[PDB]
Write a protein that binds this ligand. Sequence first.
Ligand code: AMP
Ligand code: AMP
Lengths: 333, 336
Amino acid sequence: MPLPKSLKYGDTIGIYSPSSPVTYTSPKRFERAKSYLLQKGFHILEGSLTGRYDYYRSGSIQERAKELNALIRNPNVSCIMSTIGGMNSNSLLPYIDYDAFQNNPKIMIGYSDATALLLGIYAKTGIPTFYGPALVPSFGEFEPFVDDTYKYFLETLLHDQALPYNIKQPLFWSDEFINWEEKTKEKELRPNNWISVTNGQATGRVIGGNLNTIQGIWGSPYMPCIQEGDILFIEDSRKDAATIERSFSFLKINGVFDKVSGIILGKHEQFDDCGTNRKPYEILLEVLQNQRIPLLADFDCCHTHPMITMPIGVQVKMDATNKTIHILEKWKI
Amino acid sequence: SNAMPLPKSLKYGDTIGIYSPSSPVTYTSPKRFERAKSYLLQKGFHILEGSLTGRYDYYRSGSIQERAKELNALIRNPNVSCIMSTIGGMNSNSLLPYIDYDAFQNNPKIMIGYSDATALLLGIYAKTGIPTFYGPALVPSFGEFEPFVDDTYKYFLETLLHDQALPYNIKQPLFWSDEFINWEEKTKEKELRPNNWISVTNGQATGRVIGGNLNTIQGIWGSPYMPCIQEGDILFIEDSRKDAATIERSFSFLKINGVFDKVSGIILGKHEQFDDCGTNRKPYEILLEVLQNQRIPLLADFDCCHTHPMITMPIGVQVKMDATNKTIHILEKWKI
Ligand SMILES: Nc1ncnc2c1ncn2[C@@H]1O[C@H](COP(=O)(O)O)[C@@H](O)[C@H]1O
Ligand SMILES: Nc1ncnc2c1ncn2[C@@H]1O[C@H](COP(=O)(O)O)[C@@H](O)[C@H]1O
């Protein structure tokens, strides 16, 4: 299993916009995010669609594929990071140069709609990819939370790590919908807990990402096949109960819960419970119908702040009862 | 092909069973519900109300198990000739593991509805091989005020009741509307908009029609409940009240699954209240960008979707589409 080199200070991070044109619509947060990473000691190479606008997207299918492929093919770029998600990353998949990526593995990181690319590249090349910060939402965040996200980013991509690698829970989180371009108040600190929904333990390859986005690639050559023993990692954001029930049942009818040994469920940013007062894991519990699968919920690798950086495609032990997550397998050189 | 099991044609005086696999419309829109019921009763049909009728569980009619129980009671009832959803929603795919496919296979009925009910229409077809129907749901379709309800009814009768010599020509409606108004109570006449279908890409295709609401298909794809698309199939798709970003994602989902390498033609419904995100693009223009250099005959703005009036389309039978001349003919029996 071929691995990317670790990030180093002085490296260049290439950025691209596979879907929403955030570098046009949110210039202040974009500039703040660039400045944050420049100050830490990284260089930013702006992809060819930076600053461009095509309404709901940055550009045509062909132009977005060209933007990403230029970064993949550039030997001076060690990390490729989405600016933000959207809906439209899956349009790029037939056009990506997977051979160039496989010949010179790099860190590929982002979240939400970029799940289509993270999973497509892993499915095509076998190289682990990373569910973690996207430049504008993640590194344009104001203090305090941006500094916690950054610590997790260094831990996974830069620091030497000995195995197993314990992924530690943050003390505080927020999903507050505020302080996007300009800071008004402090976000409330929410004390953190992971939730032992269904006790138990599971060990196996972690596969997943943004669940809504997975339904845009399922069945294709870009979705890695779920195998007996895998651990399912899933998150969604700003949906309602009706939407996530449909997504949970989509997994159920596909036999996913017959295969996986365990489930890790992210927090759900600004969940709309439709008046039911049910939490997302409770809707998942209904769909599971008392099948006993260890389930650990409110994991901080999702749309809430701060964000953990998780390797996808490597062995993990999750312990739902004790609320721990360990990476058992090397993800980088 | 060889003769196959088919549901019996609808007859005057038959009983239509109704069920709510997702949104609790019989609770939330009682005026339109009672009007739709009264419309079908006036034609001489009977209405058998499913067990969740008038019930409320927020976004849904009831629990996964309650909803399956409701539908199964209709499937198992020998006196019901047609099983019709009250409305869609998001949550019909939850029911799929629990449906008694054996009972449906033992006593086939006309299964009809649209939107989210696509999960069940395709699931039953996939499990049993019995054609199902993309067509009226009780509340939106038959609760519609005149004039449009009368056109929807004419197509429903022509397809499900009247005997039809094959090939069966599906006529273009003369008028349509997507106006979001007159739901519970009528405040104005809807505009009668002159209607056309659109020849997007010229050509002809003949094959088995498969499809439905495309957004709902992404909730069953890959499962035993989604019929496998075969070489030569005609893909029929519609969506409603989405934006350009959502439909580009759905069209690219079909592309990366190799669907456009298999199908011989595509029929695209009108898109009720489409949000173009400021692009001024039509849904078929976004689909054509996804198709890139691949030429496929394509007929768009077909009236089997969320706009009024609504055509009833059998699914799982051979069809001939002519995109150049804008015609659709059904080539194989769907009822006996
Ligand atoms: N106007 C805004 N105000 C607050 N948060 C925003 C705004 N626009 C985008 N976001 C955040 O950016 C994230 C990006 O989401 P995604 O589109 O899934 O990549 C959202 O989930 C929100 O947390
Ligand atoms: N309040 C309303 N006003 C007008 N039309 C509605 C209203 N609620 C539902 N509808 C119609 O009912 C349809 C239900 O679609 P679905 O949820 O997809 O089965 C919508 O797409 C609209 O055409």
